């Protein structure tokens, strides 16, 4: 498509009790409801867990404070009173025609102590080992929700860098969705007995050594709940 890039604050420093806004800009122009904004939180140990989609519409269990928005020519995340369990890197999600794209996410920090207001399930196996030229299958059980009802993402991310869509199956039918950048790289399927999502990854390389999650998407909302990641090696 087009090379664009998406781009949020490296870092914001609050203090619990405080209204804080994360934007997200788009390097094409303005932010629109076509580019249907997600946003997902990531604690440590790499948990993933998205908070807005759609613009504006609220994931399940997503606490009150957050709220998604366009604001000017950006997306906006509002947290209408931080807490000090919200210090966490918080990643932005464009739809761009044919992909998603992540910004590099912002890094928030909740400065001193404060107070504040206080199932589906996806398991992937921890890692996965592989040789150069191999071929390697991911798996990603989900229970809690009604498996066909729901899309699921791939997203490879890199440690230390940023993360990539990868591509999108919708278990009712079995229509794909992929990035161009995987497009022939991987392959998604469905085992709906099981209630499994699977990936191929075809002929591997050193650069597929990262961890890759699976992650469910109700359509116009946001990629709510997410695997745990299993993270990929290649021997070398
Ligand atoms: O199916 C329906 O009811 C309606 C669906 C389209 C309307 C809402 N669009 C999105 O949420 C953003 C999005 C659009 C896609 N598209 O429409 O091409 C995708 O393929 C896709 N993905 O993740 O792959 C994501």
């Known amino acids: 498509g087009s090379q664009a890039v998406v781009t949020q604050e490296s870092a914001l420093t609050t203090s619990p009790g405080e209204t804080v806004t994360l934007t997200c800009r788009s390097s094409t122009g303005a932010v629109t409801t076509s580019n249907y904004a997600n946003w997902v939180q990531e604690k440590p140990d790499h948990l993933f867990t998205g908070l807005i989609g759609?613009?504006?519409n609220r994931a399940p269990g997503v606490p009150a404070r957050f709220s998604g928005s366009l604001i000017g020519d950006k997306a906006a995340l509002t947290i209408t009173g931080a807490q000090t369990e919200d210090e966490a890197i918080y990643f932005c999600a464009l739809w761009y025609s044919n992909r998603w794209v992540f910004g590099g996410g912002t890094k928030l920090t909740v400065l001193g102590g404060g107070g504040g207001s206080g199932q589906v399930q996806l398991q992937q196996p921890g890692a996965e080992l592989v040789k150069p030229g191999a071929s390697v299958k991911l798996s990603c059980k989900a229970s809690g929700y009604t498996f066909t009802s729901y899309w699921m993402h791939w997203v490879k991310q890199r440690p230390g860098r940023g993360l990539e869509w990868i591509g999108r199956?919708?278990?009712?039918?079995?229509?794909?969705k992929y990035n161009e950048k995987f497009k022939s790289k991987a392959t998604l399927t469905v085992d709906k007995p099981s209630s499994t999502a699977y990936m191929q990854l075809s002929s591997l390389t050193s650069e597929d050594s990262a961890v890759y999650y699976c992650?469910?998407?109700?359509?116009?909302?946001?990629?709510?709940?997410w695997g745990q990641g299993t993270s990929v090696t290649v021997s070398s």
């Open positions: 992650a469910r998407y109700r359509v116009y909302y946001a990629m709510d709940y």
């Open positions: 759609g613009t504006n």
């Open positions: 199956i919708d278990p009712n039918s079995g229509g794909t």
